[PDB]
Amino acid sequence: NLCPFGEVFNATRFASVYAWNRKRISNCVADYSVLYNSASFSTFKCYGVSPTKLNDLCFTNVYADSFVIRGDEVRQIAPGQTGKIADYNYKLPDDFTGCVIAWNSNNLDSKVGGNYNYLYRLFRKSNLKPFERDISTEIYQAGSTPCNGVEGFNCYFPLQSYGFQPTNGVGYQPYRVVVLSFELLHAPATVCGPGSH
C-alpha cells in the first residue's frame, strides 16, 4: 500500500498556519518521484536529506505538515528563521532534516471580498518550540490590567485574519506549504522508499 502523499497535497481544503495539520506517515511505501515530477511547485527546498537518495531509504516515521501562509512569509518556513510565523505559528528545528514545499494557491484559497477563514497568531508571550501547535483563543494581555476574557484596551484577540483576495499582490497572496520531516528513531523503519531491499 502506497503512502497517502496525495491525501495532503491535493487536498481540497487546508488548515490555518496556527492550527497546522499533521499526517503521520507510517507503515507504507513511498513514491517520492511523484513529488519531484510535479513542476508546479514555486518553492522546493530540502535541508539535510538528498532528494534522489531519499528514494532508496527507510525511516521510522514521516510527518507531513500542511498550512497556508502569505507569499512574503514563505522564507520563514526554514531552519533557523525568525518572524511572526516562525515564532508564533510554526517553528522548524535548527537541526531540521526534511523538505519544505510551497506553491501559490491564489486560484484556490482566494475569494473576492476577502477569504477570512485562514488565520494566524499575532500575539504570544514566548516563542514556539519546534513543531509546537498553539490553538488557544485566550485574550492576550498586552498591559498590566487583567482582561478576564473581555476584549478591549491592552486586551487583544491573538488571531489575525488573512485578507486573501484574488487581486492582492504576490506577497499577500495565499501559499500552501507542506513540510516533510523524516524521523529515524531506534525502532523498526516502517516507511521505506521504492528502491529498498
Partner: antibody, heavy 122, light 108 residues
C-alpha cells in the same frame, strides 16, 4: 492612557556609543511589538529597530551591525544601544508601539513617546 | 522594501476647505496603513487606523479611504487647529516605511 518617557539623547563624537532608554507606563514592553524610530529634520520619519514579545529583533539596513535593541522586564524599559555612531545617525529618536491590526471591535493602541535628540559631531 | 510616496509635499488651503492627501505604496500593503499627525515640536500622533478607522477623540471632519496600493486622507472642513505635518505609514512589512510628509498651511 500610555506614557513612554525617553532619555539618553546627547552629544557624542563619531564612533562613540550611547544607550537610549524608554520607560513605559500603562504598557508591558515584554508583551508588545516595541519600535525605535528616528526622525531627521531633513529626511523625515525612519524606522530603526523592532523587538517582538517573544524576543525576536530586527534592524534597518542603515542600522544593522551597529545598533542593538533589548529590554528589561523588571524595570519595564526598552533599550537601544548605538555603537560606531556616524553623523547620519543624528536625529530625534522615539519609542512606540505601532498600532493597527484592527478587528471589527478592537484595535492595538498606537502610542508614541516624547523623543530624545541624539547629535553626532566632532 | 516598500517605497511610500505622499502627495503633495505641501498644500495651502483656507479655513473650511476640503483637504485631500494621497499616498501610494510601491507594492500591495492591503489595509495595513496608518496616518499620523505631527504638531510643530510634538511627537507624531495617531490619526487614522488601518486606512479608515478613526482614532477616538479625532473629530468627524477627518476621514480616510483607500486600499491596496492607493490611499487618501481627507479633511472635510479645515480648521486652524489642524496645521501640522501629516504622514502615511505602512507596517506589517519590515522595514516600516513612512511618507515624505505634507505641510498644512491656513490661507488668510
Amino acid at each position: 492612557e500610555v506614557q513612554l518617557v525617553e532619555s539618553g539623547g546627547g552629544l557624542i563624537q563619531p564612533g562613540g556609543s550611547l544607550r537610549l532608554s524608554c520607560v513605559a507606563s500603562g504598557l508591558t514592553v515584554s508583551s508588545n511589538y516595541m519600535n525605535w524610530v528616528r526622525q531627521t529634520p531633513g529626511k523625515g520619519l525612519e524606522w530603526v529597530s523592532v523587538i517582538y514579545s517573544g524576543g525576536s529583533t530586527f534592524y534597518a539596513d542603515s542600522v544593522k551591525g551597529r545598533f542593538t535593541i533589548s529590554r528589561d522586564n523588571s524595570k519595564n524599559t526598552l533599550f537601544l544601544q548605538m555603537n560606531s555612531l556616524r553623523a547620519e545617525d543624528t536625529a530625534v529618536y522615539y519609542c512606540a508601539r505601532v498600532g493597527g491590526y484592527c478587528s471589527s471591535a478592537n484595535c492595538v493602541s498606537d502610542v508614541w513617546g516624547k523623543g530624545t535628540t541624539v547629535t553626532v559631531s566632532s | 522594501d516598500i517605497q511610500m510616496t505622499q502627495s503633495p509635499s505641501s498644500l495651502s488651503a483656507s479655513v473650511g476647505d476640503r483637504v485631500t492627501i494621497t499616498c501610494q505604496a510601491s507594492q500591495d500593503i492591503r489595509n495595513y496603513l496608518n496616518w499620523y499627525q505631527q504638531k510643530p515640536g510634538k511627537a507624531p500622533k495617531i490619526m487614522i487606523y488601518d486606512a479608515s478607522i478613526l482614532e477616538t477623540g479625532v473629530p468627524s471632519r477627518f476621514s480616510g479611504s483607500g486600499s491596496g496600493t492607493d490611499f487618501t486622507f481627507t479633511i472635510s472642513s479645515l480648521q486652524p487647529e489642524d496645521i501640522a505635518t501629516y504622514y502615511c505609514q505602512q507596517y506589517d512589512n519590515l522595514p516600516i516605511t513612512f511618507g515624505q510628509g505634507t505641510q498644512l498651511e491656513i490661507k488668510r
